[PDB]
Amino acid sequence: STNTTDNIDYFDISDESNYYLISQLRPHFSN
Amino acid sequence: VPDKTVRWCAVSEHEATKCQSFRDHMKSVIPSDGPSVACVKKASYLDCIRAIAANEADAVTLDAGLVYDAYLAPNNLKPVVAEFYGSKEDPQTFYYAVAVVKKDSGFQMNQLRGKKSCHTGLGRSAGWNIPIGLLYCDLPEPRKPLEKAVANFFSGSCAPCADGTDFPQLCQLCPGCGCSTLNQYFGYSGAFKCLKDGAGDVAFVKHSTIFENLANKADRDQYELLCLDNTRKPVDEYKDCHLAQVPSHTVVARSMGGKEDLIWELLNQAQEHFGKDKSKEFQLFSSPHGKDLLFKDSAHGFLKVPPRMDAKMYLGYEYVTAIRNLREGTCPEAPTDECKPVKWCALSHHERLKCDEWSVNSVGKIECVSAETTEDCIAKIMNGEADAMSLDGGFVYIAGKCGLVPVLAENYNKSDNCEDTPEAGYFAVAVVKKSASDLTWDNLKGKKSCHTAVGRTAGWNIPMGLLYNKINHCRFDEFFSEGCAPGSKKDSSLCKLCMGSGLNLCEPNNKEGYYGYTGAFRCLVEKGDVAFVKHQTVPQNTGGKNPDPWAKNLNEKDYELLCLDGTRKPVEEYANCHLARAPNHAVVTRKDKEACVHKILRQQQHLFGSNVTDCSGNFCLFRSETKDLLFRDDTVCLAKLHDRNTYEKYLGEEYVKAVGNLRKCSTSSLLEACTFRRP
Amino acid sequence: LQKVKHSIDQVTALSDGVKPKQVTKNRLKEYYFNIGNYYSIFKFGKDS
Numbered sequence: 001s002t003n004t005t006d007n008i009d010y011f012d013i014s015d016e017s018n019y020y021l022i023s024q025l026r027p028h029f030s031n
Numbered sequence: 032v033p034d035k036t037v038r039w040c041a042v043s044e045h046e047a048t049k050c051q052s053f054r055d056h057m058k059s060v061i062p063s064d065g066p067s068v069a070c071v072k073k074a075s076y077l078d079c080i081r082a083i084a085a086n087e088a089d090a091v092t093l094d095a096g097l098v099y100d101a102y103l104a105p106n107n108l109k110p111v112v113a114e115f116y117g118s119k120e121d122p123q124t125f126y127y128a129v130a131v132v133k134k135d136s137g138f139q140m141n142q143l144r145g146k147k148s149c150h151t152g153l154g155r156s157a158g159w160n161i162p163i164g165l166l167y168c169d170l171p172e173p174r175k176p177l178e179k180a181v182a183n184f185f186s187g188s189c190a191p192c193a194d195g196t197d198f199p200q201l202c203q204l205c206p207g208c209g210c211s212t213l214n215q216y217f218g219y220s221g222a223f224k225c226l227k228d229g230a231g232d233v234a235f236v237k238h239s240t241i242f243e244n245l246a247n248k249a250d251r252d253q254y255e256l257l258c259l260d261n262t263r264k265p266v267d268e269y270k271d272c273h274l275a276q277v278p279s280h281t282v283v284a285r286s287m288g289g290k291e292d293l294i295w296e297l298l299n300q301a302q303e304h305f306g307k308d309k310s311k312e313f314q315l316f317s318s319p320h321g322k323d324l325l326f327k328d329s330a331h332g333f334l335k336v337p338p339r340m341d342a343k344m345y346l347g348y349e350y351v352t353a354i355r356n357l358r359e360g361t362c363p364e365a366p367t368d369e370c371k372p373v374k375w376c377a378l379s380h381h382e383r384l385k386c387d388e389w390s391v392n393s394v395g396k397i398e399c400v401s402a403e404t405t406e407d408c409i410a411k412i413m414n415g416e417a418d419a420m421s422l423d424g425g426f427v428y429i430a431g432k433c434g435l436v437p438v439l440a441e442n443y444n445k446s447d448n449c450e451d452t453p454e455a456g457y458f459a460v461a462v463v464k465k466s467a468s469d470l471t472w473d474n475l476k477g478k479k480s481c482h483t484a485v486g487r488t489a490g491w492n493i494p495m496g497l498l499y500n501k502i503n504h505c506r507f508d509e510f511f512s513e514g515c516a517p518g519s520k521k522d523s524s525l526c527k528l529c530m531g532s533g534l535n536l537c538e539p540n541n542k543e544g545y546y547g548y549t550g551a552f553r554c555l556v557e558k559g560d561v562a563f564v565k566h567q568t569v570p571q572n573t574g575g576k577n578p579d580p581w582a583k584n585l586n587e588k589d590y591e592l593l594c595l596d597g598t599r600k601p602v603e604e605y606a607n608c609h610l611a612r613a614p615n616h617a618v619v620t621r622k623d624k625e626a627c628v629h630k631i632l633r634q635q636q637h638l639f640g641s642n643v644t645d646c647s648g649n650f651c652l653f654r655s656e657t658k659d660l661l662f663r664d665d666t667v668c669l670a671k672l673h674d675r676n677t678y679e680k681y682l683g684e685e686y687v688k689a690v691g692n693l694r695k696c697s698t699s700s701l702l703e704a705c706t707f708r709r710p
Numbered sequence: 711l712q713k714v715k716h717s718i719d720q721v722t723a724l725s726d727g728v729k730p731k732q733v734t735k736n737r738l739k740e741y742y743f744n745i746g747n748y749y750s751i752f753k754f755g756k757d758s
């Protein structure tokens with residue numbers, strides 16, 4: 001049975017102006 | 032639907048071109064997530080005010096005198112961004128209003144009758160209110176309506192936006208009064224053109240108008256501007272020949288829907304890229320097909336209007352009173368023989384009880400108006416809806432910054448002549464117990480600290496001003512582990528140690544039990560480690576002096592106060608161990624009702640002072656039900672202030688410096704709004 | 711998912727559509743930059 005998480009990369013942070021969002025998928029930006 | 036646009040008002044199509052250029056050039060340097068501009072074309076300024084009220088548009092730029100016509104209901108519009116007029120180095124917020132006249136025309140200020148006059152608008156600040164308000168009371172009856180008597184005063188004139196149908200003499204020199212740039216004599220440059228074309232004998236503008244329209248020094252050496260002292264002076268010096276100072280033009284917006292953060296977010300990224308030759312392609316503060324479009328051509332920058340400041344605090348009190356008297360038409364004579372009843376101010380429904388009982392036990396000379404914080408009642412004094420207050424010296428500094436003055440100052444020492452004697456002040460201490468002997472002023476990390484309230488002298492300013500120079504950073508919610516200080520922010524640990532339930536936690540008034548000196552002593556006895564109070568707190572709650580049982584059981588000797596070097600000195604000997612000497616509290620009021628509040632409180636003191644015995648079954652103004660309400664309970668008499676009536680002179684140098692070392696750490700919004708005024 | 715649905719709603723909302731035979735150069739730049747960014751939102755949305 002599975003008691004652990006393998007993939008964690010759903011964390012993301014945005015800028016203080018909230019203009020751009022970074023992601024942990026490639027290419028790491030929308031632009 | 033782009034969902035984040037700031038609508039904007041243009042007054043003609045001739046300004047809507049400028050709005051379209053500002054929109055397309057401002058589209059680039061903001062990303063697509065940020066806000067954008069949209070343009071709405073309305074005919075006049077007042078129709079735009081009604082447009083923003085009925086949620087069509089969102090922003091426009093108006094003068095100081097038209098914000099008074101913008102906040103009256105059902106409009107409710109607030110200034111959110113104000114603009115600056117000096118250089119980038121020393122930003123000025125006020126600007127001067129002057130009256131420009133042709134050379135050798137032979138008028139001083141007092142012969143100014145029946146001569147064709149060039150105004151800039153109906154209700155604009157520098158062009159209507161100061162000229163008509165200056166020459167106002169020489170007019171004959173009936174004064175109201177104002178335009179009828181000014182219309183019979185000048186032999187024809189041009190003031191735009193006035194109703195030409197009911198009044199033809201105002202719209203005579205102009206063909207028809209139009210409230211846009213389509214009228215060729217509207218605005219600052221338009222009123223100066225009303226002087227230059229020869230049709231007008233006097234034109235009322237600001238000081239930079241003669242600079243901006245002419246490029247020749249000799250042609251500016253021709254034209255002159257007339258003073259208050261009936262003299263003519265050249266236009267190069269407007270510091271000495273100015274009529275009055277007015278606040279800046281502002282971008283108004285709604286009061287409830289806003290949205291203000293998109294206006295500031297838009298213009299803040301606008302004045303950087305587009306301010307003063309910052310882009311050569313587009314100009315924000317200049318235009319090829321007109322002048323003063325959407326902004327002034329004398330503006331250099333935009334700063335935020337603080338969120339505490341509403342309309343009436345923006346215009347001030349002198350200017351609101353001058354425009355309101357100029358609308359209603361009163362022109363007061365005012366010899367001071369009898370004084371009106373003083374509208375006192377009181378907070379939070381215990382001071383309303385004691386205040387109203389004092390209102391009935393007087394003849395009718397003291398009335399009551401309430402508030403819910405002390406910070407709001409200071410603003411209510413500044414508006415005019417109340418007159419006096421009794422404040423401790425930390426809020427005497429705030430109300431001193433804001434423009435109030437102290438009048439009478441409370442004594443504490445019993446004497447046969449205390450109306451004359453100036454007391455030095457009272458000593459601030461911190462009180463700890465016999466149960467904990469490990470405590471020490473050098474050892475205060477992670478200990479619970481009870482406080483009177485935020486902004487007060489002995490509870491916040493004096494101790495945390497001394498703790499600040501050791502800990503060197505502004506946050507005090509991380510130094511102490513816990514502690515009870517009311518009035519601070521609801522998130523802090525300083526908020527969540529206190530007891531006032533429910534939803535009244537950290538509310539700086541008698542809703543909490545822990546507010547005041549004695550409530551700081553309550554959290555000291557119950558749940559705290561150290562409290563910051565006056566030196567007289569422990570004798571007033573020691574030994575059955577309080578019938579309330581928790582102080583009925585207590586004793587003096589167990590509680591001992593601590594010095595700042597780290598030793599123990601007894602509460603009985605307070606003089607050799609104190610944090611600092613803070614001044615006594617003071618009664619503040621506006622500068623015009625100083626003599627009245629002085630007179631009424633001096634007479635009202637002798638009836639209800641400390642001479643009166645048998646307090647239960649009579650009235651004793653200085654005693655109270657141990658909660659220290661409307662007055663400090665151990666006052667003896669309201670001392671006279673002679674030669675010393677200014678927060679600088681009364682508070683003394685050491686306390687003004689001692690607060691000035693904490694002024695960068697202060698978070699009270701009303702102090703920020705009061706110190707917005709200063710250039 | 712909200713940004714994906716808003717992107718699809720705006721693009722198909724532009725597919726009614728307003729039909730000029732000619733536009734300005736900066737208007738054309740505003741167009742291609744505009745719905746190009748909507749492709750960036752959508753294709754950035756699917757894998758997330």
Ligand SMILES: *[C@@H]1O[C@H](CO)[C@@H](O)[C@H](O)[C@H]1NC(C)=O
Nearest residue numbers: 636637638639640641642643
């Ligand atoms: C106290 O009250 C009495 C009686 O009303 C009065 O005669 C006396 O002057 C008062 N005390 C002072 C210091 O004025």
Ligand SMILES: [Fe+3]
Nearest residue numbers: 094095156157
């Ligand atoms: Fe103005």
Ligand SMILES: [Fe+3]
Nearest residue numbers: 423487488489
């Ligand atoms: Fe005090």
